[model samples]
Target: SCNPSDMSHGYVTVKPRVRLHFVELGSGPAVCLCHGFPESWYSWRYQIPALAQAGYRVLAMDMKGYGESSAPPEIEEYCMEVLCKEMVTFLDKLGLSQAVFIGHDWGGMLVWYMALFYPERVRAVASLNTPFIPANPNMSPLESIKANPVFDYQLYFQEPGVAEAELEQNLSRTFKSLFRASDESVLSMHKVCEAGGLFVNSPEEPSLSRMVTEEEIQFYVQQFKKSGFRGPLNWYRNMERNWKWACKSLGRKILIPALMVTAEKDFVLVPQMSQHMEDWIPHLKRGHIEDCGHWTQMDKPTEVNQILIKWLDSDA
Candidate 1:
């Protein structure tokens, strides 16, 4: 009956209209965890108690639009500038000038943006399975992927009412198809374009995977049934906008103490992706978890926890 995900939490409006739901525990140096697309603050269930027990105030946010957080109807509402600005306000709500910002997937992207755009409000930064994609002055984010045949999944999502309809068609099936224990890249856009949807040819559900439990899986299904996929997809919709804002930081480098946690088997955000990260971060720390997939924390919580604690406590 001790589902860590079902712990103490609250909803805070960082500004005038946007409200973000978060799970807060312990009381010490603050550590805010931002989850990825198609995930809620529940994604950090393991880390929540583990971190709180470690003597840090842990705040795992639903990353606006994912769980019980505010999901604006407009696509532009999820832009990087807005997301980063809201992060600054989130700090104010905590009454802290800065806190250690930790994130995974899209959350990882946001933490980096927080460091780049609002370093004044970020004491430290950490990301799992997502690296800083340095700004490319020549190619916009969308333009770079436009010509790739493998980019069809992203392109298809760009069209409103298309992919979401397919995804919302079977909430349970969609999530099962999305989460696989193996890291062979189930998102193999190879046939997604031809198949016309993500789960058209998806394999049978693994009944949740080794990485998740029946209750945990059900939790995600119920949450998604409430919010749908529009807000999450909207993040992808603003790639071009995010890229333009990223361009503004062309020559900038991350000055905050930071850490990158890599999963060996994550095909999309592979470990090698962080190879060039040192070029962008001055005091960068790196950690690796073998036999892990995109969901680094979930698959190997103990190992990931050790890495984080070591980095956060170590001088380096």
Candidate 2:
């Protein structure tokens, strides 16, 4: 069970002792608020009340192996394939066929894969912080972001035994650096890349306090304590597998109307990462948030919630 002191709205249930902690609010048209790596659904704390007040149901889950969600022992169970199925199963358990889907960071990657594999099940899509690392029918990772070193971590992540150790030893620290945003930090973006997103260990720390709270940090520390991160790291370890599965759905453009918001100061996926995204998905709408960093929803919650509300209410 989740610490009710922190998230009173969260409930813990064990379907065969898999233990899932989730937060659900509002009452109409379900929308999943998916958080990314190094963070929990607590990242969307700011948007919960706003969306609920606006009359739309909002659900944010503690991703498996994080928070109160099931911590499956097998590393393979945390693959993108299974992780995604959890989303579908969550909807099915709630009797929802479709919902407005929103994701940030690794969560954004999931939204991309979900739309690619299950187009009929999504009504609208939104991605923040991360962009689609698309592949052609026969193109390899070398063909996708070959010249881009930002994706260089993928090779290390795919290599067994490396990423898990690197991340496990530095989970909490890495989480801080990922959400930090500062004027000085924004100016040092170039140096961040030079250090190869080994950012936590490198020089020039950004201001993470802008995005996360002390309580949320403690929440993550507790969850990570239970699962030393083999489950979440397994997500990165399966990049090649995801790439192969992606090839199976090659030549597809996002027919679902999608919205992409990028944090202006995001060290990983800067504005340029999503620049050419529209070229791939003819129906994509890209937006930029000033003063926003990798953790857009948390760093600029008011702006992020407003954008989503307007977009979600466009036809209604």
Candidate 3:
């Protein structure tokens, strides 16, 4: 068993051209953790030790374009199908036949696609804050978000060079503001496209959220400052292409046991989105974390851990 404090970092070559970086602890049935946008494997810091102590090998990875993972330059390389292929290859390179896969944010989006396309490679699937969006042939995700006033951020991310410049200009401030737990009172109603950026003008010094430590903020600041936002932003750049490829899985059901964890105050991926999830994921179990924000694993690690451990354990 490894303490979260003692988690080891290493890299695995998933393909001839791409290598992924990860932190791992314990030794048993694997439970791979994938983090959301603008976050690294470090986001899983709170859950790693607990999951390790709960008798599972916890493998938390920095998805491509974040942390130490390979950041491919081409926009098409960041497509959902390509990202899913990388994950399947990652598991094969690790010598695991199949493992329980869990993801948050964009990572959640990727794992859901994995369950759809590579069900044999996953024993069970779990996602935090992102529900599976069954493919729609009529509209791309970018188009859908553009059409819906609620998804303003997706429109901003769809454009190249815009968000990258804004976020890269101040790495520390960006993560500090972004990683904090949400306060509905301060939440903005303006669309991200209309607002022009995720931050409010006249930026204030970050009022630290309980979800993240000051040291962790500095850690993310250092990492993103080095990597820049191009690669991370590139994930959003491929949204239209992702929707096109996703059409292949239209109407496909994720037959494996699945878990959806929703945060009460996640403004974008609202808790209400999961209401219709059972219609698609027949074996789905939904868990809600009250007073939590979009960063579900970080904002409420204890409840998140309990939910994850219970579900992963049941798989054994």
Give the CA lDDT, 0 to 100, for residue 39 in model 2: 71
Candidate 3 lDDT trough over 10 residues, lowest sum: 184-193
Q: Each model's number of backbone clashes? A: 0, 1, 0
lDDT values of the candidates? 0.82, 0.70, 0.82
Residue lDDT tens for model 1, 1-316: 1364457867779877789888888888889999997788888888888888877898889897877888887899898889888878878886888889999999999999999988888889999998998887876567777666655678778887788898888777777767666653445765575676777666645356667666777878998987799999998788878888998987888888999999988766778878988877866998899998877777888998888878767732
Write one digit per residue (lDDT tens) for candidate 3, span 133-186: 787676646567767676776667767788888788778778777777777223
- lDDT string for model 2 (196-265, tens) is 4455454453344655665666666666777766666676666566777777776778888898888877
User: Ten-residue segment with the worst summed lDDT in candidate 1?
Assistant: 182-191
Off by over 4 Å in 3: 1-5, 184-189, 200-204
TM-score of 1: 0.93
Alpha carbon lDDT at 284, candidate 1: 95
Which pairs clash in model 2? 180-208
Q: What's the residue-level lDDT of 81 in candidate 1?
A: 89
Better by TM-score, candidate 2 or 1? 1
- Among residues 3 or more apart in sequence or in different chains, the pairs in candidate 1 whose N, CA or C atoms overlap within 3 Å are none
